[PDB]
Design a protein around this nucleic acid. Structure first.
Ligand code: PAR
Ligand code: MG
Ligand code: MG
Ligand code: MG
Ligand code: MG
Ligand code: MG
Ligand code: MG
Lengths: 150, 260, 156, 183
RNA sequence: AUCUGCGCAUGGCUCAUUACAUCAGACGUAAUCUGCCGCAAAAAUCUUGCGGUCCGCAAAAUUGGAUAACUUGGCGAAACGCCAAGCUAAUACAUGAACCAACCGGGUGUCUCCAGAGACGCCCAGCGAAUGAAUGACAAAACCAAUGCCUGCAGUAACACCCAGCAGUGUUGACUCAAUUCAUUCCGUGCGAAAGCCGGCCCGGCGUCUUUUGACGAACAACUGCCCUAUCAGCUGGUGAUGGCCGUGUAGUGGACUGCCAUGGCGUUGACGGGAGCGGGGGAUUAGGGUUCGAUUCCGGAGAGGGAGCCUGAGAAAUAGCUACCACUUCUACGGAGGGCAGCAGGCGCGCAAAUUGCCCAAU
């Protein structure tokens, strides 16, 4: 198991690095382990009580991810799999997914994702796929070289 | 960073009444000074009655329908000031911002040929990178290769469509100016004598068409032609001639009685 | 023939634990141009300030090294030009001028002697005694109190 | 923080100034750099306008100019020799503006052999050396310490402001000024 | 819904502070920063594709990794509190454009020439920044060497061809500035053609780096002015008081600040200390001279419970931002978590003394 998260009996996170068994008081920046980036303004260093990374008896939750699988399968985590929700949207990142050629078109290899509603003439939702350079974009980009020298 | 004007601290030439709201449209930085411009919301609403309020006034401007110097201005707070040319293609009217002889802004109607050129006064000269000598203008223009006889006090005729400085008017004794500041603002006169006084303000002595002598600072004078007959631009209906306050008071009573 | 024989140290001006030099021009040019060299010998920076003030005989042909000086530095004279009388010269290279004026009282229809004292930086081009009338020109701050700088001295 | 105002200074009358505002950010000063000799470590400082002012800590090299020859060479600082402010800044070997340092002198000798052709023979085709060298001569006090190995020099840049240790070589009466104060 | 881009530094309140301060009229910034906005500028960068192992042939450069929202599992009494994993964008972040495609310059090795000239080769040559140097003007003949046209000197921009006039000429009252030339090198703390978005039937609207200046500003400096008090006559200076020299720090000037030296500076023309309290525009009364009031709408200054200290940004020493202490203070499941009406309505006090916990963005 990779121990990589945690909380207390009070909801306070276990920040990785501080090497204590207590709750300590840090002036955490925004986007750090104790203070989210939407709660505050742009400078905004807010002082929070966070808990140490050294594990102890006063812990209500440890987050672990498996790095190696042992013997017994009897658990709902390793017996099943759930699909990735979204296929790729970038044009060159969806070209590597299906190992396509350079000349090959990317609009045919987009994921379908049917949406079905009872009595609604059900429908498909496909991404508007980004960074796909049409010949209309190629003429637009080769004009900026012409008019910068002109 | 101020962002508001109070309508009392607004300039008096805009003629916004003090009882209609606390605020006036603070003109953005741009070509003209805040004290010395008329922003496009006041022209479209208060001068011309094309708009009854500021909400009808941005239906005109944000749609791209008012052109200040051949370019559409979608800002109600764009500073339009002296010698600017305001076109409107739909209503087919084009105007020039001039000062009338009482000092206020006046919209002089134009033709199509007179609406292409504007007259601009050099404010600074310097050399830019390269060895290109550019000329800084009261309207904020930076003409890159002006006429080599350009000095600071001069006037460049510009032709805003084809952005080519077609002419130059030097600032000398024999020229005619318009006064754009002070008590004498809006008056037109020949130049008589320019008193230098280095380190301080140049004083320029001026004589009018009638012969009225008056002086200003030479940073206030704006040369507009070779003489008072050969003016390069058309001027408002008094043509820089300031009548007496008694004689102009008599004429309005005579005109009002003769009208009934 | 390879050796150059540069100038010896002028100990009359060199007193001050760092070498006293002018930042504007280099003293050590071998074939220095006629731009900044004065009449007799050495390289010197001298400047013409604005308002019809003639630079003295020193600051062109002197030997002294002055910063903060209007004729031989980057100090520019601008703004106000005033006059005062010299009060005390006890400070080093700085005088205090005295500006005496009459203040009219609108109530009692009578004037009133007042004065303002100004600390003024005085160049070694000038040696004003007490009571001498000077002309001062405004410059940047040069100390806690020095804003003006002497341009001309009118003796006695 | 550190301020640069006259609110704490006494009046010229000796009176105390009674303070009726807080400190402004527009009047701040910052802690000094104290640039020393060492391998280069700099920390930028976010100045007004968003401009960056590069603190120099621990500088060892800079572009030093030989002004009679109107050239510069990137050389390595060896020691800090004399400082006009204090002798204590020499001992801790602080780099400030106008402090006297010794530099490498090897690119200057190599340039003086490549230009003027004088060492301290190979291009027989180009003797534009002879087109120079006749009018020009070199000060003896330069040529002594140039072949001795290290040249005394003067720092002409502000390192805590710019993060550079540029300089000029001492010549003329200025070299003869500082040679007397050392020895 | 969330990333992203701007804004929240304005407006609004209040007048506690405050007398070489603020403020007014008038100047200065050549001592400096300056987003948005206006007119402009822009020739740096050996990148892609395919094949072979570093080269070849090509060209509308079809670039790369990560996060939100979301899902899953949730912790916590709560909190404008939080964790871990799994997805996925860009005008977020990072990377990166050869040739088309210039002129101009410096340093330098072989090769055809003549008794120094050309061709070729190599290193370097962009805007901005640092340091150094050079510009940034000026106010009669004789002889020898190199060199200029003449067939000894008539007459003459300058320059060994490519361009026979492709800067011999920036601005100011004044500059060590504007700009240019060359020397060295900028190591992230700069420079994309957003590797961008629409629209019309190639072209047109936008959107963005850098660079530069006008504009709207900011910050500093101080010419003249200012209620009462001597039952306040000396004030300042070791620990900066007045000045000077190197620096430092700043956005910049500067005792602003370190080191060192000097012995100054202010005052009976009222310093210094104490009391009253924002400063003007202005109001009340006034024959004239005046005597008073100005918390209050406009301008400026200051403050956000007192006092600090910061982050972020072009701009804050910000308070419907953060951190801390002091004085009060609210919720708690006792583990903890929060408060800041001199915004508008209101509330309690305090007093002689001052309103609606209202409707709306229709106008400004
Ligand atoms: N008087 C103001 C200036 O203070 C300077 O010196 C001051 C400092 O040495 C020192 O001031 C310290 C300060 O350094 C430190 N960073 C913070 C501390 N609060 C200050 O202390 C000062 O202030 C507090 C409160 O008023 C007093 O309690 C304290 O006794 C006083 N010494 O004490 C001196 C003031 O008494 C210089 N002497 C001079 O520039 C000038 O005197
Ligand atoms: Mg955002
Ligand atoms: Mg009063
Ligand atoms: Mg200094
Ligand atoms: Mg106010
Ligand atoms: Mg307290
Ligand atoms: Mg209230």
């Amino acid at each position: 198991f990779r121990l990589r998260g945690g909380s207390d009996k009070d909801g306070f996170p276990m920040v990785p690095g501080v090497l204590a068994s207590s709750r300590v008081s840090l002036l955490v920046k925004r986007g750090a382990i104790g203070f989210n980036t939407f709660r505050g303004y742009q400078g905004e260093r807010r002082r929070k009580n966070v808990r140490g990374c050294v594990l102890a008896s006063d812990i209500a939750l440890v987050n672990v991810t498996i790095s190696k699988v042992g013997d017994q399968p009897i658990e709902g985590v390793t017996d099943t799999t759930a699909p990735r929700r979204l296929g790729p949207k970038r044009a060159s990142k969806i070209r590597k997914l299906f190992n396509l050629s350079r000349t090959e078109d990317v609009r045919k290899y987009v994921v379908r994702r049917r949406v079905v509603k009872s009595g609604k003439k059900d429908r498909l939702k496909a991404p508007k796929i980004q960074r796909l350079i049409t010949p209309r974009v190629k003429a637009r980009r080769a004009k900026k070289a012409k008019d910068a020298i002109a | 960073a101020k962002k508001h004007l109070k309508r009392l601290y607004a300039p008096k030439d805009w003629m916004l009444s003090k009882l209609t709201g606390v605020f006036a449209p603070r003109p953005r930085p741009g070509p003209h000074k805040l004290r010395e411009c008329l922003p496009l919301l006041v022209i479209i609403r208060n001068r011309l009655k094309y708009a009854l309020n500021a909400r009808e006034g941005e239906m005109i401007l944000r749609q791209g329908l008012v052109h200040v110097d051949n370019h559409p201005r979608r800002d109600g707070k764009y500073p339009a000031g002296f010698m600017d040319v305001v076109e409107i293609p739909k209503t087919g009217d084009r105007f020039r911002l001039m000062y009338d002889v009482k000092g206020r802004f006046a919209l002089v109607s134009l033709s199509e040929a007179e609406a292409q050129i504007k007259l601009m006064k050099v404010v600074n000269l310097y050399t830019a990178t390269g060895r290109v000598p550019v000329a800084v203008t009261h309207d904020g223009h930076r003409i890159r290769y002006p006429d080599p006889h350009t000095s600071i006090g001069d006037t460049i005729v510009y032709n805003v469509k084809e952005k080519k400085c077609v002419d130059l008017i030097k600032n000398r004794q024999g020229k005619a100016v318009i006064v754009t500041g002070g008590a004498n603002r809006g008056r037109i006169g020949e130049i008589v004598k320019v008193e230098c006084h280095p380190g301080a303000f140049n004083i320029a002595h001026l004589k009018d068409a009638s012969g009225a002598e008056f002086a200003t600072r030479a940073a206030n004078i704006f040369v507009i032609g070779k003489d008072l007959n050969h003016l390069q631009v058309t001027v408002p209906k008094q043509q820089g001639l300031r009548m007496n306050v008694i004689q102009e008071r008599e004429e309005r009573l005579i005109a009002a009685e003769a009208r009934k | 023939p390879q050796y150059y024989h540069a100038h010896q140290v002028d100990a009359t001006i060199q007193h001050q634990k760092a070498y006293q030099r002018q930042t504007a021009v280099n003293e050590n040019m071998h074939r220095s141009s006629r731009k900044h060299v004065n009449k007799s010998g050495h390289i010197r920076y001298a400047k013409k300030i604005g308002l019809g003030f003639k630079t003295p005989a020193k600051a062109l042909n002197g030997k002294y090294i002055d910063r903060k000086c209007p004729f031989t530095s980057n100090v520019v004279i601008r703004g106000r030009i005033l006059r005062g009388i010299v009060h005390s010269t006890k400070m080093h290279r700085t005088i205090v001028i005295r500006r005496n004026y009459l203040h009219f009282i609108k109530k009692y229809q009578r004037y009133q002697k007042r004065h303002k004292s100004l600390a003024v930086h005085c160049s070694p081009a000038f040696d004003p005694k007490q009571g001498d009338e000077v002309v001062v020109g405004q410059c940047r701050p040069l100390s806690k109190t020095i804003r003006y700088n002497v341009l001309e001295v009118v003796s006695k | 923080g550190i301020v640069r105002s006259r609110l704490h200074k006494r009046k010229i009358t000796g009176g105390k100034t009674k303070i009726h505002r807080k400190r402004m950010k527009a009047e701040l000063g910052r802690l000094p750099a104290n640039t020393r000799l060492g391998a280069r470590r700099v920390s930028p400082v976010r100045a007004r306008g968003g401009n960056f002012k590069i603190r120099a800590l621990r500088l060892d090299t800079g572009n030093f100019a030989w002004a009679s020859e109107a050239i510069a060479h990137r050389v390595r600082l060896l020691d800090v020799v004399y400082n006009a402010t204090s002798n204590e800044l020499v001992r801790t070997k602080t780099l400030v503006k106008n402090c006297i340092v010794a530099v490498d002198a090897a690119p200057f000798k190599r340039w003086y052999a490549k230009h003027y052709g004088i060492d301290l023979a190979s291009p027989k085709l180009q003797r534009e050396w002879i087109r120079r060298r006749r009018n020009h001569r070199v000060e003896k006090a330069i040529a002594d310490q140039l072949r001795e190995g290290r040249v005394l020099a003067r720092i002409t840049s502000r390192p805590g402001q710019s993060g550079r240790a540029d300089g000029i070589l001492l010549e003329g009466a200025e070299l003869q000024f500082y040679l007397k104060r050392l020895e």
